[PDB]
A paper describes a structure:
In this work, the crystal structure of [name] was determined and found to present a unique tetrameric organization as a dimer of asymmetric pairs of subunits. The structural characterization of [name] in this work, indicates that [name] subunits are composed of three distinct regions with a 60-residue N-terminus, a central three-helix-bundle spanning about 150 residues and a C-terminal region that contains the residues that interact with MG200 and appears to be mostly unstructured.
The symmetric interface, with a total buried area of ~650 Å2, corresponds to interactions across the two-fold symmetry axis and involves only subunits A and C, while subunits B and D do not contact with each other. The tight interfaces, with a total buried area of ~2*1200 Å2, correspond to the two interfaces between subunits in the pairs A/D and C/B (within each pair subunits are related by ~72° rotation). The loose interfaces, with a total buried area of ~2*450 Å2, correspond to the two interfaces between subunits in the pairs A/B and C/D (within each pair subunits are related by ~108° rotation). The organization of the [name] tetramer, with only a two-fold symmetry, can be defined as a dimer (C2 molecular symmetry) of asymmetric pairs of subunits. In the [name] tetramer, the four Cys87 residues (Cys87 is the only cysteine in the whole [name] sequence) are located close to each other, in particular across the symmetric interface, suggesting the possible formation of disulfide bonds between subunits.
Residue numbers in the entry:
A (entry chain C): 66 to 203
B (entry chain B): 67 to 203
C (entry chain A): 65 to 204
D (entry chain D): 62 to 205
Amino acid sequence: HNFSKETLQKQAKRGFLLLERCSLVGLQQLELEYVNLLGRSFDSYQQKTELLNNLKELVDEHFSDTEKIINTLEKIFDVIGGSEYTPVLNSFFNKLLSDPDPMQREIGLRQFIITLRQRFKKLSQKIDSSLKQIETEA
Amino acid sequence: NFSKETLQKQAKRGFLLLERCSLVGLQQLELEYVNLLGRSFDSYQQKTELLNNLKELVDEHFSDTEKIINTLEKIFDVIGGSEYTPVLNSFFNKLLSDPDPMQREIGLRQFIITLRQRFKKLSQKIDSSLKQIETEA
Amino acid sequence: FHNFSKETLQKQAKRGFLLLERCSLVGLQQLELEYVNLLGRSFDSYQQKTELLNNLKELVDEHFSDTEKIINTLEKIFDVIGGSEYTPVLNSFFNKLLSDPDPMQREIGLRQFIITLRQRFKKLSQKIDSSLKQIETEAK
Amino acid sequence: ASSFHNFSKETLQKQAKRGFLLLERCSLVGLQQLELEYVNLLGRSFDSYQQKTELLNNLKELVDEHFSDTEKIINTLEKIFDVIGGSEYTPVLNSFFNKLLSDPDPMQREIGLRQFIITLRQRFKKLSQKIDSSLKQIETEAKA
């Protein structure tokens, strides 16, 4: 309740562009980097494990940064959610963020967040699986 | 020496550097490191070289970051504990937008710390890796 | 480009380079990883595996081509402002020279980046072809 | 649709230019992203099928949407050329995708632009084609 309602719109927008252009793009890399590690035959194990932990640490870090953004974005919606001031975003990927109806643009954004979380969670989960699989194999 | 509200405006600009430029660079570098590890191809002489290279970049950036922080601390020497602590929407800390200026000061200090932690932690890994590789030949 | 304002060219050169860094290279990094990812996948079949490489190959060639086009324009720009003060300044996080005060260095930096980029692209297409041969002989 | 013969010939130049910067800086960039997104989907093992198919349809829809927006721009750009085509007023554009748009000769700049359009269309069509192939491949992979 502290800022101008349209300033929040502008912020919300910026916030979201982070998620799309930075947060998600990092995540796509990381998913691929994981697969890449698995592909590298056996190495030793001490060496393989190390690289996952290493990966894991980065993913947790980046997930955390992502969450912080989301969090600030949700807090913004605490004011402009269910309002006209829901920002408009020509995303190439979720079609709803450009929708003329602000309800839809809200939905769109919530979806994007969920999706993003799903994917992050799902990655940390695989990495942990792999680390257990390797643990027991050694 | 300067107008108390000019310093506010500067502090704000200073901080937007940290968030929008310093941190973003750091996030990239963290990812670049991981990327190097992932790459088999090379030899070792070639692998090592790329880390040193990375290392140099990180130390360079860390240095630039420290310089900003330093200026920002100096600014707070004046407007710390005051009403003129700038207000910043931010996606990395909720306190910078807080109506209470004390909180906004705390927020900023936290951000700095967190940043330093991350930078230090990276240079540390890079050095570990460089030793690991050293011994592996 | 013998036609444009020397500082307009600076601004263009800069924009050109941000493409390479922020778009061209970022795509390339993903593609390299996508290749490795394909190799990692069992079972699929073969008809299905090959198809996905060709598919990848096509994209890489396409994106390499787009990258070359940019470079090309960038070289043409340097035909004018190469060896000049108007060489653009770029805080890249990756090549340190593009921010150098000396414009000679900034030129060198840029040339290096290009080379590096080409190396990486060429090297990828070459692996993909190897793999496609390896697979060809392993099946048909 | 409409026609332009009536606007100021240099206003059209300015518009044509703006129109083209859309294609280069927005339309093409979107397309490059989409091509990469497709490849990315194929790469993903994990999910199911109902889930895989869905994401393609989704992609497909986006591509058709974007292609449509692109066509609309082109269309306007062609209409503009109906007037300033074969003229001196063909706009001048530095470009990283075609060397001809900066050419001093306006004939060349016209050629350049036409080429860019074509190329763009080729790429868009080619993507929708692959996506449809993939969707059939997946469809048949469900069976007895």
